[PDB]
Amino acid sequence: HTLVWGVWVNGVDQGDGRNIYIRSPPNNNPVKNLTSPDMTCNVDNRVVPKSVPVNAGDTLTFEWYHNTRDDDIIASSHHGPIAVYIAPAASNGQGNVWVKLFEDAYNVTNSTWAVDRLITAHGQHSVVVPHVAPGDYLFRAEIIALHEADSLYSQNPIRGAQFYISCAQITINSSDDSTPLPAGVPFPGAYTDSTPGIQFNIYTTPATSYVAPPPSVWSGALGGSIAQVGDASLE
Numbered sequence: 001h002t003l004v005w006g007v008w009v010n011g012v013d014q015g016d017g018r019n020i021y022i023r024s025p026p027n028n029n030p031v032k033n034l035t036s037p038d039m040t041c042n043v044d045n046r047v048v049p050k051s052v053p054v055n056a057g058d059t060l061t062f063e064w065y066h067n068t069r070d071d072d073i074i075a076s077s078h079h080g081p082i083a084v085y086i087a088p089a090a091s092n093g094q095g096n097v098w099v100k101l102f103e104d105a106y107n108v109t110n111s112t113w114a115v116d117r118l119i120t121a122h123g124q125h126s127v128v129v130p131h132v133a134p135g136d137y138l139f140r141a142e143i144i145a146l147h148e149a150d151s152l153y154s155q156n157p158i159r160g161a162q163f164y165i166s167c168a169q170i171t172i173n174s175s176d177d178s179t180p181l182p183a184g185v186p187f188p189g190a191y192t193d194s195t196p197g198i199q200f201n202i203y204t205t206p207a208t209s210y211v212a213p214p215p216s217v218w219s220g221a222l223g224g225s226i227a228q229v230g231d232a233s234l235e
């Protein structure tokens, strides 16, 4: 159970974005229905009044929280992967539009899931803004908690993978458009009951065997990381 508070750009806090530049849902409940329109940008998908200005090559940091800013972030039970997608705003996230900029699942060296490292990062994970056409974009940050993912929601609605989905309105101003955005996948539509990484048993299956849901990360993606960029407690 987690939500996005706001974003940082190049290590500078853009301020509380809830219902302002984040299309915030009313609470931190997960989305579980893979076929639901709620998979696109969660349960209150509407245009919010601001869009955060960035340039290609900027570092865009999402900041998550549980109940209050810079708290326990997400229950340490909620092991799973993290991804970020982009689509043009014109789409409203409908159709084959979502392009993957970032994926982290299980790190063999540190023996840690993306979610474990997000807690250590005080809720902060980043992407580098790609060299796409200037204009208005949606960045969709997605955490998949796998603690009940031995079952499928479609078969047992009281279990299943849990999706914490947040859409940020981002305006890309300076970009030479040298890596124009390629075709995307649909949400809902990309994840189905047979997709690798949707049904998994984290209690019996080695985390080293976990494969995150496709699609693969776009070759045009400029970088990204789970790491604290800024100290919320200094405001």
Ligand SMILES: *[C@@H]1O[C@H](CO)[C@@H](O)[C@H](O)[C@H]1NC(C)=O
Pocket: 033, 034, 035, 036, 037, 157
């Ligand atoms: C899953 O979402 C689809 C599409 O909106 C809907 O028809 C179906 O009733 C949903 N399932 C549940 C259990 O609400």
Ligand SMILES: [Cl-]
Pocket: 030, 031, 032, 033, 036, 038
């Ligand atoms: Cl749901």
Ligand SMILES: [Cl-]
Pocket: 120, 121, 122, 226, 227, 228
């Ligand atoms: Cl960190």
Ligand SMILES: [Cl-]
Pocket: 059, 126, 127, 128, 223, 224, 225
């Ligand atoms: Cl980064």
Ligand SMILES: [Cu+2]
Pocket: 001, 002, 075, 078
């Ligand atoms: Cu939860």
